[PDB]
């Protein structure tokens, strides 16, 4: 009656894990001599990419078990590492530093942040030495001894050696598109209310993901995607407090950041072909770095987040926002890098609200040059100073939060900003993507018989 | 193996259609090692793409393969002697280069899937 | 090439059996360079394994291939309309996943080597 008929090219797939390859704009590669996140390891992108709607297809997605996020983590860290191998290693700079206060033009907030430090340094000739001065930040220098000798050491020098970023290499995140090799497909959830888990009734297949900028930040997702309809609350388990809650804004909050100091860059020769760039002298008055957010915009977005949180924690629960309990500087402050300078902003103003069931904010930011990226101990880098005044505009497109546990009373829920792991920063963009394996061989009954 | 390679590239199309095996046998084979591996892998992928194109036309294991696709005089209105006894395959490829995809789409999906469905439905009888 | 890829994954099995070339054409294409080379080589090996499976069933160069293997109602007792006009290939694969190897071993060695030996012995006559 019925016989086996073999079909090749059937639209059947299974969940799979593969090694994806990027796609990037060749244009920006011509504009960008080098970018830490290499466009050379990657490939030029294809204009007019294709997205086919898989009508009548409902696919199961898991934002919290996605290997695209892990591959992105591996790729970004490895791209950073190879972008920092050729650059100069600042081992000769691990010397005693005689440091004194800088009080030329200082406001009461910036008192003691910068120090004038003198030290003996190597020169291009191995038989001669020089005494050179540079300004250093309090966060990059540690007292050598308890006694007030005013002798200082760089924080890394005990545990590790600190590389210097090449001055030519740029830090601007450029979009990268993650593409699937032959025999694999990327399925994109087109549902506008999806929380990253469970069945997705609106699915499409894409050659490559949308351009994702590797923006490294804590407590606030910058320059990311925005929710189409409503603020999106996404946690692996919302009841669990050990899992960070990722918030997506439907409307961004514009944030204006600046370091008003007019900085200079001083070349110091430490070897035959090796240079060390230093802070030089700050032309003009010295004022603290800070960031401005619109207060009304922040309050309206916070109300929207409160409404979405109430959808998960009760209709009469009190949603309180408070600031970080503690930890390293990266997590306790809104850490980010824009222009090549690494900022650290106190977001206590941002999270200072109790929401009962019924003009700008200025954030004092701090600057550092010794940066330990990606929660690794022993691989610090020195950020060369950026010359001039830096002004900086970004969109706050989301939050990373942690809910306080052990609540004695059940009417309130406290949420504090968090971060530090960028797998939860890059999972807020890849939440709607899953890679699948095509199984093109099928066998089905038909009445047809081989002669 | 290499002997006679491309030796009928200045011969007529018919004379050059008798040496196809010579050119078919010549299509398959540190940082330098990965560059050469990438070259070899691209040669393999290219051979596989060509064989897949042959196979989706009902032309597997065939160096000459006839089809059920009529020739359109818009593609070329030349007479058989002109093409086969008075032209080379290079000149031919120059002439038809802007019509190749139309022919390849008339072979890809129309002719082969139609024919293949009809063989299935005749095997039902 | 990519246009229409997987677009009949929510269509009925019969409607999806008319777009097989779209999915067949989409199966072939520093430390990063070797990772991508390994991905490309695994895609090539996977395509070759599938084509070898087709070839050991007498199904070379064929996207639809009929066989001499009877269907067992133990594998699936559904009627033809249910399968071809009321099911998708994904649901089908979910249903038959635990019977695939039995069918593949009834195609691998029984049917094809029997048939092939009989063609040899008929060519003797």
């Amino acid at each position, epitope marked *: 009656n019925l016989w086996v*008929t073999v079909y090749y090219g059937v639209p059947v797939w299974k969940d799979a894990e593969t090694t994806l390859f990027c796609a990037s704009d060749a244009k920006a590669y011509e504009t960008k001599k080098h970018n830490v996140w290499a466009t050379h390891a990657c490939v030029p992108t294809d204009p007019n990419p294709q997205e086919i709607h898989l009508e009548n297809v409902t696919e199961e997605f898991n934002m919290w078990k996605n290997n695209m996020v892990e591959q992105m983590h591996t790729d970004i860290i490895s791209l950073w590492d190879q972008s920092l191998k050729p650059c100069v290693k600042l081992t000769p700079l691990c010397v005693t530093l005689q440091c004194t206060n800088v009080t030329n033009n200082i406001t009461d907030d910036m008192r003691g942040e910068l120090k004038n430090c003198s030290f003996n340094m190597t020169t291009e000739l191995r038989d001669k030495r020089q005494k050179v001065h540079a300004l250093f930040y309090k966060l990059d220098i540690v007292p050598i001894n308890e006694n007030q000798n005013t002798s200082y050491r760089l924080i890394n020098c005990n545990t590790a050696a600190i590389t210097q970023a090449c001055p030519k290499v740029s830090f601007e995140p450029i979009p990268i598109h993650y593409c699937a090799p032959a025999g694999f497909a990327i399925l994109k959830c087109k549902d506008k209310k999806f929380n990253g888990t469970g069945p997705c009734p609106s699915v499409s297949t894409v050659q490559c993901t949308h351009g994702i900028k590797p923006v490294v930040s804590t407590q606030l997702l910058l320059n990311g995607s925005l929710a189409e309809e409503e603020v999106m609350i996404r946690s692996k388990d919302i009841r669990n407090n050990a899992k960070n809650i990722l918030v997506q804004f439907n409307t961004p909050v514009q944030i204006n950041c600046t370091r008003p100091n007019n900085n200079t860059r001083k070349s110091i020769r430490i070897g035959p072909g090796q240079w060390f760039y230093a802070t030089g002298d700050i032309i003009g008055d010295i004022r603290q770095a800070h960031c401005n957010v619109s207060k009304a915009t922040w309050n309206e977005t916070l109300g929207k987040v409160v409404k979405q949180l109430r959808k998960h924690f009760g209709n009469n629960t009190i949603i309180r926002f408070a600031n970080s309990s503690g930890g390293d500087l990266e997590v306790t402050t809104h850490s980010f890098n824009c222009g090549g300078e690494f900022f650290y902003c106190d977001t206590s103003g941002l999270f200072n609200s109790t929401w009962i069931s019924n003009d700008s904010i200025t954030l004092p930011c701090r600057i550092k040059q010794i940066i330990n990226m990606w929660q690794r101990i022993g691989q610090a880098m020195y950020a060369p100073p950026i010359q001039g005044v830096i002004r900086c505009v970004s969109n706050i497109t989301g939050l990373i939060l942690t809910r306080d546990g052990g609540s004695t009373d059940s009417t309130t829920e406290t949420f504090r900003p968090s971060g530090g792991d960028m797998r939860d920063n890059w999972r807020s963009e890849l939440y709607k993507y899953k890679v699948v394996k095509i199984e093109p061989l099928g066998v089905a009954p038909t009445r047809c018989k081989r002669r | 193996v290499f002997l006679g390679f491309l030796g009928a590239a200045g011969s007529t199309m018919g004379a050059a259609s008798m040496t196809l095996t010579v050119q078919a046998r010549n299509l398959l084979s540190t940082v330098w090692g990965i560059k050469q591996l990438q070259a070899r892998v691209l040669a393999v992928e290219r051979y596989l793409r060509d064989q897949q194109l042959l196979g989706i036309w009902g032309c597997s294991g065939k160096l000459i393969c006839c089809t059920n696709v009529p020739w359109n005089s818009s593609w070329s209105n030349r007479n058989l002697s002109e093409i086969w006894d008075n032209m080379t395959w290079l000149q031919w490829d120059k002439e038809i280069s802007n019509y190749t995809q139309i022919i390849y789409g008339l072979l890809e999906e129309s002719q082969n899937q139609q024919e293949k469905n*009809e063989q299935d439905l005749l*095997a039902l009888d | 090439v990519f246009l229409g890829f997987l677009g009949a994954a929510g269509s009925t*099995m*019969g409607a999806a*059996s008319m777009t097989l070339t779209v999915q067949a054409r989409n199966l072939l294409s520093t430390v990063w360079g070797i990772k991508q080379l390994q991905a490309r080589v695994l895609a090539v090996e996977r395509y070759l394994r599938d084509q070898q499976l087709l070839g050991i069933w007498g199904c070379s160069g064929k996207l639809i291939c009929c066989t001499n293997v009877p269907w067992n109602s133990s594998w699936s007792n559904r*009627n*033809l309309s249910e399968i*071809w006009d009321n099911m998708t290939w994904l649901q089908w694969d979910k249903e038959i996943s635990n019977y695939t190897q039995i069918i593949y071993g009834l195609l691998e060695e029984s049917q094809n080597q029997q048939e092939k030996n009989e063609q040899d012995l008929l060519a003797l006559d």
Partner: nanobody
Amino acid sequence: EVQLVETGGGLVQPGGSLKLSCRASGYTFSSFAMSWVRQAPGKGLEWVSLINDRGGLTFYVDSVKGRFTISRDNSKNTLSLQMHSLRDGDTAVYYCATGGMSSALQSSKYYFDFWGQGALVTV
């Protein structure tokens, strides 16, 4: 619901050319095979031609293989029969009918379930 209406019958001279046609309404015309069956005025039924659902498999009775030609347009829902060189044995009332074969993806349909009104050809 199913209705097949034949048109194009007439009086032809031996050796002439005619074009019978059949219109359909009430079902998906493109998912069924169609057949032509003739009844001579004083004799029983005789199968003439068969065409598959798609329209690319055509079968004829031994008598009429080279002369008759069956064809179908699945957009106009019309079946046609071109008859060249009509001899004297071709006089009969012709019925367009639904069935005779089926696709691999459907069950066997070795029968005619729906017939037409009829169209008399005298030659």
